[model samples]
Target: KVFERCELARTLKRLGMDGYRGISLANWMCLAKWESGYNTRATNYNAGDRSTDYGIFQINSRYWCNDGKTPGAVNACHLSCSALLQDNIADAVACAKRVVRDPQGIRAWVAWRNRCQNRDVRQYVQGCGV
Candidate 1:
């Protein structure tokens, strides 16, 4: 599947490996659905400067790949433009997994969903399963 290019599915499996089994797939799918509608070509406005973010997850190239000194920086953690432009799923998924494993992680995702449910975001509420 096209998702394999970014190792999306593979990363989901890996996330489960660390005991996130119950909600990993659902959480990933939900985020993907909202972030870019699963469209690998999606782009979005980062702010009001006309600059944009790109790819399946709509990652901000300015923060993930570009040199931050200008409007973006060459952060040590940022991937190179070549890799970013390639729409590498492994990199994207890896980054997401790291965040999901943080202190609050998926639990926070669950709470966000609950809050959205109260506000009737509908999709966001349903996506972040409790």
Candidate 2:
């Protein structure tokens, strides 16, 4: 099932990501909005590279996930890409931090760089009482 936005926030909060890595819940929520539409099972192709981005952070298979489609793929998240498709995001959250540690940083997602970066997306958490 797709997560309601509030549920997503609450889950992330429980995982201690509300302000993890100096990134705000609103920022992560905004990324989820664009990357997966908050759908736990979301997956999309990168037409430019023929790679797939999986789950909420839209972690790329080429570097961080192994979907078996990308040869020599690195499972930096050390997880089954399928796991990211589940209702539980704990793994996804852990993997997301790894990506942030990448040189690309949060700029890994076109969504964040273009829309959420340097913007006050705090509105994403308005009613969740986070």
Candidate 3:
């Protein structure tokens, strides 16, 4: 789970998303720290619920698995892998920028975080602080 932070930084810079340099680095660190404690191969499962999540970002396999069931079917690991995987950082940064560009601006990000504040899925919103 110990990814090359330097490499990830370089990838972000090459993606034309310099605005997120600071936040991206910090967010990546926090995600690794909390999600699976830096465990790239971690998997979460429930006896009652056969569905499970996997990989570094803990992407739900039921949703992201490449079985033609969801939007992520193309990029199967888009969520599981970091931006370094396939310039996905660009998408992440762009989405963040879009949220920040709203009339509500950064508040939109805050609202998202507040909404998911108590959920394990908070990582998606936590990156806004970066």
Tens-digit lDDT track of model 1 for 1-113: 24432344454455342235334454555556555655555766655655555445454555454534327443233554333334445555553444445565544444446
Compose the digit string of candidate 3's lDDT tens values, residues 20-117: 43344334434433555444455667465465544444444443443234333444334433332233445434433433344653332233354333
Whole-model lDDT values for every prediction = 0.46, 0.75, 0.42
Task: For candidate 2, write residues 49-95 as lDDT tens digits.
Answer: 88887777777778888878897788898777877777788887787
Off by over 4 Å in 2: 126-130
User: Where is model 3 more than 4 Å wrong at Cα?
Assistant: 1-23, 67-130
Which whole-number lDDT from 0 to 100 does residue 66 have in model 2?
84
Error of 2 at 70 (Å): 1.4
Quote the positional error of residue 104 for candidate 3 in Å: 14
List RMSD in Å for every model shown.
7.2, 2.3, 9.0
Q: Which regions in candidate 1 have their CA more than 4 angstroms from the true location?
A: 1-11, 14-23, 67-76, 82-84, 98-130
TM-scores of all candidate predictions against the true structure: 0.51, 0.80, 0.38
